Design a protein around this ligand. Structure first.
Ligand SMILES: CC1(C)Nc2nc(N)[nH]c(=O)c2N=C1C(=O)NCCN1CC[C@@H](SC[C@H]2O[C@@H](n3cnc4c(N)ncnc43)[C@H](O)[C@@H]2O)C[C@@H]1C(=O)O
Length: 155
């Protein structure tokens, strides 16, 4: 299965943190990275009084079940990051899509519950998967077209 993972951090110098997370993602069992988006410098969603975020998207090939993947992303977050509601964030890993699967459990909502509202998630994803279609038939290209989210600056 191809899972799409969003990465975020707003450490002041987040490159080492993001690279460590990227290596950790590739080290997940039965999984490997297919593609990584560019790194993007995005203004904070929430209070203006904090550093910019580094956001990126990762295409991860995996044979793990989706809840097993979440266990690994949550582990990586605990091992590589620290700390609230509107930031700042040491390191966040969001499962945006998991193949074509729809998941609504206590722990896991796939597609990600709010990605449709977040240009810092949609634009990095569109870079690496411009033709992406969501399980319900929505098109990533159309969401960006409908909402006219500001394009992002690279890191
Ligand atoms: C401050 C803010 C708003 N401002 C930003 N501004 C810019 N510019 N850039 C940013 O990146 C940025 N970040 C922001 C930010 O707050 N980041 C948090 C994003 N993530 C982190 C992972 C999960 S943590 C909580 C539960 O979610 C459950 N959960 C359910 N479904 C899923 C799923 N599909 N994947 C992972 N966890 C899932 C688990 O069970 C967990 O217990 C959800 C959270 C979110 O999205 O609310």
């Amino acid at each position: 299965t191809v899972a799409y993972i969003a990465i975020g951090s707003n450490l002041a110098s987040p490159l080492e943190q993001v690279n460590a997370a990227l290596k950790a993602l590739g080290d997940i069992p039965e999984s490997h990275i297919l593609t990584v988006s560019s790194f993007y410098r995005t203004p904070p969603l929430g209070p203006q009084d904090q550093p910019d975020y580094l956001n990126a998207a990762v295409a991860l090939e995996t044979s793990l079940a989706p809840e097993e993947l979440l266990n690994h992303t949550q582990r990586i977050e605990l091992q590589q990051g620290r700390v609230e509601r509107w930031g700042p964030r040491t390191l966040d890993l969001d499962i945006m899509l998991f193949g074509n699967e729809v998941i609504n459990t206590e722990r896991l909502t796939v597609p990600h519950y709010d990605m449709k509202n977040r240009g810092f998630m949609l634009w990095p994803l569109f870079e690496i998967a411009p033709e992406l279609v969501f399980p319900d038939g929505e098109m990533l290209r159309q969401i960006l077209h409908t909402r006219a989210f500001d394009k992002l600056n690279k890191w």
